[PDB]
Curated annotation (Swiss-Prot):
It comes from the Eukaryota. Belongs to the SNF2/RAD54 helicase family. Component of the 1.8 MDa SAGA complex, which consists of at least of TRA1, CHD1, SPT7, TAF5, ADA3, SGF73, SPT20/ADA5, SPT8, TAF12, TAF6, HFI1/ADA1, UBP8, GCN5, ADA2, SPT3, SGF29, TAF10, TAF9, SGF11 and SUS1. TAF5, TAF6, TAF9, TAF19, TAF12 and ADA1 seem to be present in 2 copies. SAGA is built of 5 distinct domains with specialized functions. Domain I (containing TRA1) probably represents the activator interaction surface. Residues 17-63 form the Chromo domain. It is found in: Nucleus. This is Chromo domain-containing protein 1. ATP-dependent chromatin-remodeling factor which functions as substrate recognition component of the transcription regulatory histone acetylation (HAT) complexes SAGA and SLIK. It recognizes H3K4me. SAGA is involved in RNA polymerase II-dependent transcriptional regulation of approximately 10% of yeast genes. At the promoters, SAGA is required for recruitment of the basal transcription machinery. Disruption phenotype: Decreased sensitivity to the cytotoxic effects of 6-azauracil. It comes from Saccharomyces cerevisiae (strain ATCC 204508 / S288c). The 2 chromodomains are involved in the binding to the histone H3 methyllysine at position 4 (H3K4me3). Present with 1620 molecules/cell in log phase SD medium. Changing H40Y: Confers interaction with methylated histone H3 'K-4'.
Length: 63
DNA sequence: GCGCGTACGTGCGTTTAAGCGGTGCTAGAGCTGTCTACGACCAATTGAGCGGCCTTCGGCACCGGGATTCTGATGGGCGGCCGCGTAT
């Protein structure tokens, strides 16, 4: 019944180097996240500072 | 008792491999069947084994005889006693 992160769909950049770290992935890339308990038609391009603390976060870290 | 520290329990997510029932294959247990070697049994003779009884040399620790070293009464000779004592 909770509105958490299920799987990851697509990924792109948000703001239009040798190795981008997690900070560059936060303030430089947006990711299409599929939410649990919901169809795949409600995929939204979200990051970390736009959703806050949500259920399930290690999957997007590994991806 | 108390206080500091941290490691181990509880959670979620990721991940890895047990358990399920499906088939195939043949090895190794179990059965089976004939022979005969090896163990039980009975016999008769013999000495290893047990009770009965007292053995001898070597090793621990107490011992043995003879020369030699240290302590004690002995003794003439050089000195000191100053105080009673006989002679003029």
């Amino acid at each position: 019944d909770f509105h958490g992160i299920d799987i990851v769909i697509n990924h792109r950049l948000k703001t239009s180097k040798t190795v981008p770290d997690l900070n560059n992935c936060k303030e430089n890339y947006e990711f299409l996240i599929k939410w649990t308990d919901e169809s795949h038609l409600h995929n939204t391009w979200e990051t970390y500072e736009s959703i806050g603390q949500v259920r399930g976060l290690k999957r997007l870290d590994n991806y």
